[PDB]
């Protein structure tokens, strides 16, 4: 069974726990390239009453650094906002809770904006079929595959 955070049957408690960044995508590719602020490796999602605590690590010169962020529910169901390198809002267009989670985020900084899409897995990698489903979801948002970066070969410290 699958759901979308904006859907009526979404059960947020079911996305609690361990997650790993498998693939990131963006219509501003530099944001997720080696030195980008959005090249974030998710570790866990802690589900609270009206927020999600997101725990990540970032990488620089082969050195990991821990980063935690709190995302608050907005006025629209299934949407959350969080301040990080500008103002972000995001939703989870598709997840099956037990294997993958696909997120779509809009960042706004210095009067500009860009889209970020992320595929996270319960294990450190996902099947090629799920990775293809993610590439299709990116295409529906106008993000070319050349702007999709598989990070499954570099998501561990
Ligand atoms: C700031 O959030 C993020 N930034 C980079 C990568 N992934 C996320 C998780 C979101 C999309 C739910
Ligand atoms: Na580039
Ligand atoms: Na909106
Ligand atoms: Na969408
Ligand atoms: Na969206």
Swiss-Prot record:
Keywords: Disulfide bond, Pheromone-binding, Secreted, Signal, Transport
Gene: Mup1
UniProt function note: Binds pheromones that are released from drying urine of males. These pheromones affect the sexual behavior of females.
Disulphide bonds in the chain: 64-157
InterPro entries noted in UniProt: Calycin (IPR012674), Lipocalin (IPR002345), Lipocalin_CS (IPR022272), Lipocln_cytosolic_FA-bd_dom (IPR000566), Maj_urinary (IPR002971)
Tissue: Abundant in the urine of adult male mice but absent from that of females.
Principal cellular location given in the protein's record: secreted
Source organism superkingdom: Eukaryota
Compartments in which it is found: Secreted
Family named by the database record: Belongs to the calycin superfamily. Lipocalin family.
GO biological process: aerobic respiration; cellular response to food; cellular response to lipid; cellular response to starvation; cellular response to testosterone stimulus; energy reserve metabolic process; glucose homeostasis; heat generation
Gene Ontology terms for molecular function: insulin receptor activity; pheromone activity; pheromone binding; small molecule binding
SUPFAM superfamilies: Lipocalins (SSF50814)
One GO CC term on file: extracellular space
Any matching Pfam family: Lipocalin
Protein name from the UniProt record: Major urinary protein 1
């Amino acid at each position: 069974e699958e759901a979308s955070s904006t859907g009526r049957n979404f059960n947020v408690e079911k996305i609690n726990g361990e997650w790993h960044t498998i693939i990131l995508a963006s219509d501003k590719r530099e944001k997720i390239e080696d030195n980008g602020n959005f090249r974030l490796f998710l570790e866990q999602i802690h589900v609270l009453e009206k927020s999600l605590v997101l725990k990540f690590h970032t990488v620089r010169d082969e050195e990991c650094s821990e980063l935690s962020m709190v995302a608050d529910k907005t006025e629209k169901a299934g949407e959350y906002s969080v301040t990080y390198d500008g103002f972000n809002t995001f939703t989870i267009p598709k997840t099956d809770y037990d294997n993958f989670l696909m997120a779509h985020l809009i960042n706004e900084k210095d009067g500009e904006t860009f889209q970020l899409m992320g595929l996270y897995g319960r294990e450190p990698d996902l099947s090629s079929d799920i990775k293809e489903r993610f590439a299709q979801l990116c295409e529906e948002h106008g993000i070319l595959r050349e702007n999709i970066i598989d990070l499954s070969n570099a998501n561990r410290c």
